[PDB]
Design a protein around this ligand. Structure first.
Ligand SMILES: Nc1ncnc2c1ncn2[C@@H]1O[C@H](COP(=O)(O)OP(=O)(O)OP(O)(O)=S)[C@@H](O)[C@H]1O
Ligand SMILES: Nc1ncnc2c1ncn2[C@@H]1O[C@H](COP(=O)(O)OP(=O)(O)OP(O)(O)=S)[C@@H](O)[C@H]1O
Ligand SMILES: Nc1ncnc2c1ncn2[C@@H]1O[C@H](COP(=O)(O)OP(=O)(O)OP(O)(O)=S)[C@@H](O)[C@H]1O
Ligand SMILES: Nc1ncnc2c1ncn2[C@@H]1O[C@H](COP(=O)(O)OP(=O)(O)OP(O)(O)=S)[C@@H](O)[C@H]1O
Ligand SMILES: Nc1ncnc2c1ncn2[C@@H]1O[C@H](COP(=O)(O)OP(=O)(O)O)[C@@H](O)[C@H]1O
Ligand SMILES: [Mg+2]
Ligand SMILES: [Mg+2]
Ligand SMILES: [Mg+2]
Ligand SMILES: [Mg+2]
Lengths: 423, 316, 328, 349, 96, 330
DNA sequence: GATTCGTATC
DNA sequence: ACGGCGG
DNA sequence: GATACGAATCTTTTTCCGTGCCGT
């Protein structure tokens, strides 16, 4: 049929996966096939076409007939009925259950049901359970049709957003992140396919010029399936049809690094910025990206650059923060940051490591402070007929009121600085 | 009341009448004859032949079974996850096709589909790949999720050149025996800006209005693309000429100030021979003017001030 | 009946004869109507230029007594979401036209307010039922319409109305209302309109109401400036001359006296001075930049309010400053 | 209770820190039937709320200080259930729409409109005839709740009256100020604060050693009576019922943190110093301290350094003004709070 | 492709008469085809629920006029437009 | 009774002072029936709402108003949904039949009026959804838009609405009305007063009547039967005394940054408004003859920038100190 | 995209 | 007459 | 023995998908 379906691996050695990752997956899987196995779930996450399920199928074609099929799901509570009958696959029915089919997680209700049902699976009191494996493909979700929801699963389709922290942190859940197929494996396999089609490629007179495309494809995509599809399309072609492969999305920190340091592929700042906006406007249009720029522009040279440049960068960021959510604001801010870091960049710089903004922690602390202040206010209102504005609680009482209400206690009420101390 | 517009009257019915993308069209004809058409994603800009080529491919491939073989779905039709769960019965249908032929599911405007629909389309494309094939047609390929693009062969249609527009215009003219001159057709191509549909519409309007396709008659009913007048205004040396363009060719012609500002933003993004610092300063000034326009001050003085600031940051 | 209507609605054109100013588009659409083929049209231009009137008169010369069964007019006052496009427009296009006047027409007035999903869904309704229906799109801002929608629509640009068209229509209104207008008053009216028919009609109605004896009483330029509350040309010239030549105190006093004589606002004076400044022969080219930047800032601040006495002094300072670099 | 509440004046004759203003309030309360809408503005802690409560007592007699809390809930434009504390009195009402955030519009359009629509007539009804509603922190209304008040208090003024307490009237729109009578509440002089503290220590046992330390309290409070009494109780509790001249004038922790930030900025001017300044600013903001106050105190601590020349101070104040304007028209405060610091240490170098 | 065929007996189908678009000349062997959207066609279900006899009439312009009489009771007139438009499939299914 | 602002509100169109260019037109409408769509814009407290209410009262009367008038203001929701359903349905309504009393006493025009007060607060989509609602039903329904900033009204809507600008009420056109209120409230004032009230109240008669009411309240309270002086009205308004202004400007003349810093620190405790002191400084610095052209040119822009920053809702200590420092370095 | 550790291989 | 067909 | 390569880490607070009436 199709090369990515006709040349599918028949053994693990034909699977395009790294040796160490393969070892980790193998040992984890075998440990999940033990009578009382610490780990109940195996959440494999990664980009598309990284042999996430290919390797699982091959491994369950060996492990299953050793301690005992893959029983794949077919995507409100239909998944409940499926999993209500996916637990009887016990010994003599041990059949690694693979959930590559995700019950619709773009819908709030069945997303919560998916999460709260996999939790019940995690906390099940049954003494014997089948090895549960979930494959989630990390793919940025494009810009919708004006969707004003703009929720978590409306920006990125990732495990973190489908599952809840507890699910992903549960001691009995093992997560093995997957990486794009390296060019070594990609060339090694795209050449095996060519020594199986050297006949047609010879009569086509492309068998001679095969390693050029085998290398260009291996350098353009980490997707094995897309690589094989592009190879099939080029081989069956006649003329000099352009070799185009699928397009992948950059990461958040990848985009930050591109803005700060740049990209080797392009030494043009304008072209790089325009392409980043064109292909990635679902992240370059979120305030967290500008917060990341502010938090990580000091990771250039480990923070050993002029103060004038830092002042210019932060001043521009502040100016663009009052330009509303306009498209020009980000295009100005990122361009200014890149220009500033381009003029000062040289050779000999041991750049630092970037980090995610801590604004979420500050917001959580603000919420905690609010919760603290409210108790003080109502206590006063019921015990001293006292109404105090939250502004005065945050500027005067938060500090004086607990000091007095504790010192008088020193000789129901608050004895500690409202919202914790200032450090 | 019986004539059809030239855009639809002369829509190609065979792959040999689709100008441009020579290599892509040749590949499509080869797929039409050989068979075994892969999953494809056809991107590009408006008016290039992304749907006139997928429909022609489906015609020349399925042929007589083009009624029970081509399940066409587009934005005008509902395409929720429920629809994707019409796309399952069509795939499960067994039809006796010639060897090498497969059913085609033409999902026009796949960039407007919901993500749940795409996540289910993956299931359909995985379970029924041996009987039916999917032909996505879109304007921006990034709107299709990466797992779907992984299973498909991406074919990007480039902008139609002036020669492939002139050749099709000459064919249509010989079929419609209209009168022309070289300068008129050059002006029609110039105003088309790589759009075949817009070129046909402009030629039809010029023929209806006057009959003779010359430069004057074309330009008195079709205006020169305003992005190019914005670019001319932004690249002026002194402020006199820039403000002069802004007034005569943009303000007195009826273009809205907000349209001018948005076009200026895009022009600046794609401007050449300008330093990066200058470009980002101009972007900032255009953003400030956009802010002022959106707040209510849609006046010519704001645009004049923006051009003055651009000149000020150019000359230093 | 039609005698208790505002002049902007009482004088709405009923046939393509009465639409003035836009000659090329009217000629083209008349030829399109006669030839019997009408493409998907898109009308673009400033507000009050005659787009709705033109399309409605065209759809009355194309249908007639069945202009209510053949034309489906949807505008911003109606919901035009994805469901509306998928159901109402699709069912209007799919059905048959009882053979009446060939194709059916769909007029989408104020399409710039339509969501992108609806415009994207309308693409395959425009080009599928083009054999039975023709779509017309009216919009003032072309940046809010998807490029695909612009591709499949024939673009006709409605220019701001020239002086001759305004003069002819003003003469029609005058004859129909038995009014007299002096040439200077007509100049002032055509200049204050800024290529707008609705402004012309409203100002003329206010002028008629201002006159004691609507008949036998003429509308001079003074009446126009009183009713519309705009500065006289002499007032703008006097304020500018005082700013340019006289000292700070005399200029401030003259500005205040001019504004208090007739309660003139500051924004209209700013605009009037801006035009004269645009006409000047400056020789430094930084005068122009400072003038434009400072006066735009002042106008924006005025748009948000504030001390109206600080802003006049700001204007005087901006002018003197800029016109000190001219002598540099 | 606290000495700020225990000694709070509870009548118009008990006010002793401004007599012209008290005479004006008495003149207003002599004929309560034609009382207009009032807007009390002045420095924080001068006693504006105390003066409002005294005026309400004077108009509606004793009965206004018996406050009880009512829980009132709304829903935003979408299905967002929201809660607002409503402390009410048999003769007046008090709400703080700023406590609910940007959605004070629904509060103003529902609670205030409902109270303004009810006539209050009780069998053919100055006292329990019209209603007084106090809007605390009228500055924090988001330019839209002030639009919904223009007609609410102009059309239904026969059965409701509005008296709002705001420190400063810059963020209040012109139409709102136009419909109301502006009442200015100047800060008390140091002598008046000293006299009030002397009265408190006379009714208390703090056992003062010199009446030149109460003057120190007054000078350190910068005209804030609540803060003055808070320090008085602080020292009179930490130093026992004894206030020696060596007793330490206690200042808020965030103030000394801002002073440490100032000293760090003056000493170290480098990118790493900038990052530590950002960390300290984040710590301050984690305590819900408003960013405009942070910027104001940082600027006025930078201007207090004796090692800076006039040009550095002028640049500092210019940057402070620019970044205060930016902060007002902004969404995230950290950007502007960091830009101000960066420019400051780019100028001092 | 589902079909519901009304019987030829006189109790269900009292009278069927096909004309050449003039309502005067009756001919046999020719069929008139009406392609209607069922969204509009379901609008007469609630009216047929109380109908004794229903009269169907269609002209060549593509207008179906459903006449419903109730038992005097109430008279209901529904006018329905025809789609643009499978015809050969219709003919082949009913010849089969 | 009631505040003098809600007690001297014009009841008919003859009580609306200072605005004849619009009141004359609206009065001529009474005899005719061709009232256009109206856009009332002007400074706050100029009489737009009073004018429209008087016109409505004179056109319909108390009985027919409840059926032929719809008023929507910023105190009620006016989103896109409300605009597209409620306003459209009211415009689509048929004109109610006037009674015999109404027809025999009031003109009773054959249309209704939709009054959209505070239309500047409406979103652009809501205003766009009004255009065809006004155009289609113009013969059975009329629209009146009231706003303070005409720029917040979209151009398409401003085109269909006749523009009536309400002038600012200064001491030269509103002195008669304030005098009438004074003589009808038995308010005794010195010569010069009732003009200083209108000078302080820049283009606002609502505030120039509230100030007079407060001055009269205080004067009645003191009880000496003496007139009200300019000093009293100034103090009540919030005007900074001239001596404090002279001290401020002497400190500015000195130039010392710390002296100015401490004087501003002690001045902000007095509670004076930044806008008022900025305005007084503007008057002083511009109308004086002891300063050169360049000084005035620079200070006009400085005051303009400070006023613009203050209008945005910023700290007044930072803005006043910066303005004074800048004025000290020119 | 950067650093750091760890292989695998020539 | 009772069972089945908001986030 | 050099080095290219590779893995880990650098993270979270308008439009569309689901759960009363008739037969025995
Ligand atoms: N050497 C190879 N190793 C692995 N897979 C191969 C190889 N050659 C062909 N394939 C095929 O490539 C495809 C890879 O699919 P997978 O990566 O397992 O699915 P995936 O990771 O879920 O990708 P997505 O996100 O679903 S599109 C399968 O159809 C394999 O049969
Ligand atoms: N390659 C081509 N050769 C000749 N005519 C073409 C070509 N491409 C488009 N056209 C004309 O364009 C019209 C059909 O437009 P389409 O090809 O469907 O546009 P499109 O490429 O699908 O762009 P979108 O996605 O619909 S906006 C007809 O009038 C065709 O004659
Ligand atoms: N060319 C014209 N000749 C005569 N009257 C005109 C002309 N253009 C506009 N008018 C008048 O202006 C009124 C408003 O113009 P319309 O055509 O209805 O609206 P429009 O010009 O389409 O502007 P928009 O975009 O709808 S706000 C009409 O009712 C006429 O009375
Ligand atoms: N021309 C006038 N003659 C008499 N009284 C007037 C005049 N203009 C305003 N007023 C008084 O001003 C007060 C309020 O006037 P309004 O017109 O209701 O307010 P406004 O003009 O709507 O300003 P807004 O609502 O802030 S835009 C009333 O007490 C009126 O009596
Ligand atoms: N005249 C006064 N005499 C004694 N204490 C006063 C006086 N005015 C204000 N205070 C004290 O100031 C404290 C806070 O005043 P407050 O009402 O918060 O002012 P503001 O409303 O301006 O914040 C009160 O607890 C009160 O004891
Ligand atoms: Mg897979
Ligand atoms: Mg297409
Ligand atoms: Mg229109
Ligand atoms: Mg009003």
């Amino acid at each position: 049929e199709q090369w990515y379906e006709k040349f599918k691996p028949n053994c693990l050695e034909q699977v395009a996966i790294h040796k160490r990752k393969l070892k980790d997956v193998q040992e984890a899987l075998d440990a999940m096939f033990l009578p009382n196995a610490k780990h109940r779930i195996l959440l494999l996450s990664g980009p598309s076409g990284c042999s996430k399920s290919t390797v699982i199928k091959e491994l369950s074609k060996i492990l299953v007939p050793k301690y005992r099929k893959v029983t794949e799901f077919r995507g409100m509570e239909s998944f409940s009925e499926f999993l209500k009958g996916a637990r009887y696959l016990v010994m003599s029915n041990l059949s690694l259950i693979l959930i590559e089919d995700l019950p619709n997680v773009f819908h709030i209700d069945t997303r919560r049901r998916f999460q709260q049902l996999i939790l019940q699976w995690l906390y099940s009191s049954e003494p014997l359970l089948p090895p549960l494996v979930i494959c989630i493909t990390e793919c940025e979700i494009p810009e919708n049709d004006n969707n004003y929801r703009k929720f978590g699963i409306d920006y990125t389709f990732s495990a973190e957003t489908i599952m809840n922290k507890e699910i992903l942190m549960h001691p009995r859940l093992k997560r093995i992140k997957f990486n794009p197929i390296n060019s070594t494996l990609l060339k090694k396999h795209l050449k095996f396919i060519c020594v199986q089609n050297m006949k047609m490629l010879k009569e086509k007179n492309k068998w001679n010029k095969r390693q050029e495309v085998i290398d260009y494809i291996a350098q353009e995509t980490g997707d094995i399936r897309s690589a094989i599809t592009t190879l099939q399309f080029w081989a069956t072609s006649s003329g000099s049809l352009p070799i185009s492969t699928r397009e992948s999305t950059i990461s958040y920190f990848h985009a930050i690094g591109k803005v700060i340091h740049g990209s080797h592929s392009t030494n043009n700042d304008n072209e790089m910025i325009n392409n980043l906006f064109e292909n990635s406007n679902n992240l370059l249009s979120k305030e967290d990206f500008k917060l990341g720029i502010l938090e990580n522009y000091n990771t250039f040279n480990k923070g050993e650059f002029s103060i004038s440049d830092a002042s210019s960068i932060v001043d521009c960021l502040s100016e663009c923060d009052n330009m509303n959510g306009l498209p020009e604001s980000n295009e100005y801010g990122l361009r200014e940051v890149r220009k500033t870091f381009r003029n000062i960049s040289k050779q000999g710089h041991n750049h630092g490591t970037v980090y995610f903004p801590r604004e979420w922690k500050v917001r959580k602390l603000q919420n905690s402070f609010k919760v603290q202040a409210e108790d003080w206010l109502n206590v006063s209102l019921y015990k001293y007929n006292a109404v105090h504005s939250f502004r005065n609680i945050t500027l005067e009482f938060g500090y004086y009121a607990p000091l007095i209400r504790k010192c008088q206690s020193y000789k129901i009420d608050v004895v500690d600085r409202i919202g914790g101390p200032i450090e | 009341s019986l004539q059809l517009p030239w855009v639809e009257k002369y829509r190609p019915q065979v792959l040999s009448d689709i100008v441009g993308n020579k290599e892509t069209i040749d590949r499509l004809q080869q797929i039409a004859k050989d068979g075994n058409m892969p999953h494809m994603i056809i991107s590009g800009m408006p008016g290039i032949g992304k749907t006139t080529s997928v429909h022609c491919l489906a015609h020349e491939l399925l042929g007589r079974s083009y009624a029970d073989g081509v399940l066409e779905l587009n934005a005008s039709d509902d395409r929720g996850i429920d629809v994707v769960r019409q796309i399952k019965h069509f795939a499960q249908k067994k039809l006796h096709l010639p060897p090498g032929k497969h059913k085609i599911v033409i999902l026009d405007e796949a960039d407007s589909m919901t993500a749940g629909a795409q996540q289910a389309l993956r299931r359909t494309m995985e379970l029924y790949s041996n009987s039916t094939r999917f032909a996505f047609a879109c304007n921006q390929s990034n709107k299709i999720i990466e797992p779907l693009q992984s299973r498909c062969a991406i074919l990007r249609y480039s902008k139609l050149s002036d020669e492939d527009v002139l050749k099709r215009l000459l064919q249509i003219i010989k079929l419609e025996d209209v009168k022309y001159t070289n300068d008129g057709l050059e002006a029609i191509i110039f105003t088309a800006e790589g759009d075949m549909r817009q070129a046909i519409n402009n030629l039809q309007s010029t023929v209806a209005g006057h009959g003779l396709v010359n430069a004057d008659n074309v330009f008195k009913i079709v205006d020169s693309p305003h992005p190019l007048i914005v670019k001319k205004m932004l690249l002026a040396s002194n402020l006199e000429d820039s403000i002069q363009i802004l007034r005569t060719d943009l303000w007195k012609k009826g273009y809205s100030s907000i349209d001018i500002v948005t076009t200026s933003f895009r022009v600046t993004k794609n401007l050449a021979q300008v330093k990066e610092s200058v470009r980002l300063e101009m972007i900032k000034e255009i953003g400030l003017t956009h802010m002022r326009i959106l707040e209510g001050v849609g006046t010519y003085l704001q645009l004049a001030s923006m051009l003055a600031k651009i000149h000020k940051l150019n000359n230093k | 009946s039609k005698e208790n209507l505002p002049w902007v609605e009482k004088y709405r054109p009923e046939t393509l004869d009465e639409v003035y100013g836009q000659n090329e588009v009217i000629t083209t659409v008349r030829k399109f109507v006669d030839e019997g083929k009408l493409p998907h049209l898109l009308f673009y231009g400033p507000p009050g230029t005659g787009k709705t009137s033109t399309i409605v008169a065209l759809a009355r010369e194309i249908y007639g007594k069945n202009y209510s069964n053949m034309v489906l007019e949807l505008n911003a006052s109606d919901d035009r979401g994805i469901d509306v496009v998928r159901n109402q427009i699709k069912d209007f296009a799919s059905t048959r036209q009882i053979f009446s006047k060939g194709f059916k027409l769909i007029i989408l007035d104020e399409a710039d307010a339509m969501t992108n999903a609806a415009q994207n869904a309308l693409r395959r309704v425009i080009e599928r039922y083009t054999k039975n229906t023709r779509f017309c799109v009216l919009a003032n801002y072309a940046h809010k319409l998807t490029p695909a929608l612009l591709s499949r629509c024939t673009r006709f640009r409605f220019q701001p109305l020239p002086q001759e068209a305004i003069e002819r229509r003003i003469a029609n209104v005058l004859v129909h209302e038995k009014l007299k207008l002096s040439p200077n008053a007509e100049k002032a009216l055509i200049e204050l309109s800024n290529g707008d028919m609705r402004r012309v009609l409203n100002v003329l109605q206010s002028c008629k109401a201002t006159l004691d004896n609507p008949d036998e009483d003429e509308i001079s330029d003074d009446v126009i400036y009183e009713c519309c509350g705009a500065p006289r040309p002499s007032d703008l010239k006097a304020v500018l001359k005082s700013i340019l030549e006289d000292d700070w105190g005399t200029a401030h006093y003259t500005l205040n006296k001019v504004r208090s004589a007739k309660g003139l606002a500051l924004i209209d004076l700013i605009e009037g001075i801006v035009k004269i400044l645009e006409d000047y022969e400056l020789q430094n080219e930084e005068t122009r930049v400072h003038l434009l930047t400072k006066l735009a800032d002042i106008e924006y601040s005025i748009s948000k309010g504030g001390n109206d006495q600080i802003q006049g002094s700001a204007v005087i300072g901006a002018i003197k400053a800029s016109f000190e670099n001219e002598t540099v | 209770s606290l000495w700020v509440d225990k000694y709070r004046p509870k009548s118009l004759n008990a006010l002793s820190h401004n007599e012209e203003l008290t005479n004006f309030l008495k003149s207003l309360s002599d004929q309560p039937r034609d009382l207009p809408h009032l807007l009390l503005y002045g420095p924080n802690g001068t006693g504006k709320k105390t003066r409002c409560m005294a005026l309400l007592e004077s108009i509606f007699g004793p009965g206004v200080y018996r406050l009880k809390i009512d829980v009132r809930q709304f829903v935003t434009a979408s299905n967002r259930k929201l809660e607002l504390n409503v402390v009410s009195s048999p003769y007046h009402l008090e709400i703080t729409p700023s406590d609910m955030g940007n959605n004070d519009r629904i509060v103003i359009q529902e609670l205030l409109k409902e109270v303004a629509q009810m006539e209050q007539v009780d069998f053919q009804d100055l006292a329990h005839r019209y209603k007084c509603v106090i809007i605390n922190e009228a500055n924090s209304l988001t330019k839209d709740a002030q639009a919904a008040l223009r007609r609410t208090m102009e059309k239904y003024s026969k059965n409701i009256r509005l008296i709002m307490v705001c420190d400063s009237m810059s963020p209040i729109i012109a139409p709102i100020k136009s419909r109301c009578l502006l009442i200015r509440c100047p800060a008390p002089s140091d002598s008046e604060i000293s006299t009030i503290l002397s009265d408190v220590v006379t009714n208390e046992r703090i056992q003062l050693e010199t009446k030149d330390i109460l003057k120190r309290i007054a000078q350190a409070s910068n005209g804030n009576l609540r803060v003055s009494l808070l320090m008085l109780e602080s020292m009179a509790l930490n130093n026992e019922l004894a206030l020696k001249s060596s007793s330490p004038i206690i200042k808020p922790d965030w103030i000394i943190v801002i002073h440490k930030l100032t000293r760090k900025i003056v000493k170290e001017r480098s990118v790493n110093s900038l990052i530590e300044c950002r960390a300290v600013l984040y710590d301050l903001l984690a305590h819900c301290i408003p960013a405009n106050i942070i910027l104001k105190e940082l600027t006025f601590s930078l201007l207090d350094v004796e090692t800076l020349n006039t040009t550095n101070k002028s640049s500092i104040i210019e940057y402070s003004s620019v970044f205060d304007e930016r902060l007002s028209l902004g969404n995230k405060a950290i950007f502007h709070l960091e830009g101000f610091i960066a420019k400051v240490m780019c100028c001092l170098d | 492709f589902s079909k519901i065929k009304l019987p030829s007996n006189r109790s269900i189908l009292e009278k069927l008469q096909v004309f050449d678009g003039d309502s005067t000349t009756v001919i046999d062997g020719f069929a008139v085809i009406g392609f209607f959207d069922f969204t509009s066609f379901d609008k007469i279900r609630k009216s047929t629920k109380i109908a004794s006899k229903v009269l169907f009439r269609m002209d060549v312009h593509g207008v179906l006029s459903v006449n419903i009489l109730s038992q005097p009771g109430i008279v209901i007139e529904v006018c329905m437009l025809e789609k643009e438009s499978a015809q050969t499939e219709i003919e082949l299914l009913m010849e089969t | 009774q009631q505040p003098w602002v809600e007690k001297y509100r014009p009841k008919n169109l003859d009580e609306v002072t200072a605005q004849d260019h619009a009141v004359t037109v609206l009065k001529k409408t009474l005899k005719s029936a061709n009232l256009p769509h109206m856009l009332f814009y002007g400074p706050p407290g100029t009489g737009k709402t009073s004018t429209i209410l008087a016109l409505t009262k004179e056109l319909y009367g108390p009985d027919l108003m409840k059926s032929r008038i719809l008023e929507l203001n910023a105190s009620d929701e006016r989103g896109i949904s409300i605009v597209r359903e409620k306003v459209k349905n009211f415009a689509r309504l048929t004109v109610s039949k006037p009674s015999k009393h109404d027809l025999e006493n009031y003109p009773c025009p054959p249309y209704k009026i939709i009054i959209l007060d505070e239309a500047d607060s409406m979103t652009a989509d809501a205003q766009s959804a009004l255009r065809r609602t006004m155009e289609t039903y113009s013969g059975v329904t009329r629209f009146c838009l009231i706003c303070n900033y005409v720029t917040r009204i979209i151009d398409p809507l401003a085109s269909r609405c006749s523009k009536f600008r309400f002038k600012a009420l200064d001491a030269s056109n509103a002195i008669d009305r304030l005098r009438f209120i004074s003589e009808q409230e038995n308010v005794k004032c010195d010569d010069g007063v009732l003009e200083r009230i209108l000078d302080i109240s820049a283009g606002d008669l609502r505030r120039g009547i509230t100030l007079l009411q407060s001055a009269s309240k205080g004067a009645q309270y003191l009880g000496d039967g003496k007139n009200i002086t300019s000093t009293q009205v100034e103090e009540l308004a919030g005007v900074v005394p001239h001596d404090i202004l002279i001290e401020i400007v002497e400190k500015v003349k000195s130039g010392d940054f710390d002296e100015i810093k401490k004087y501003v620190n002690t001045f902000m405790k007095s509670g004076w408004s930044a806008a008022s002191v900025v305005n007084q400084l503007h008057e002083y610095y511009i109308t004086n003859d002891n300063f050169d052209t360049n000084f005035k040119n620079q200070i006009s822009w400085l005051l303009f920038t400070t006023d613009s920053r203050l209008n945005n809702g910023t700290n007044e200590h930072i803005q006043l100190l910066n303005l004074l420092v800048k004025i000290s370095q020119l």
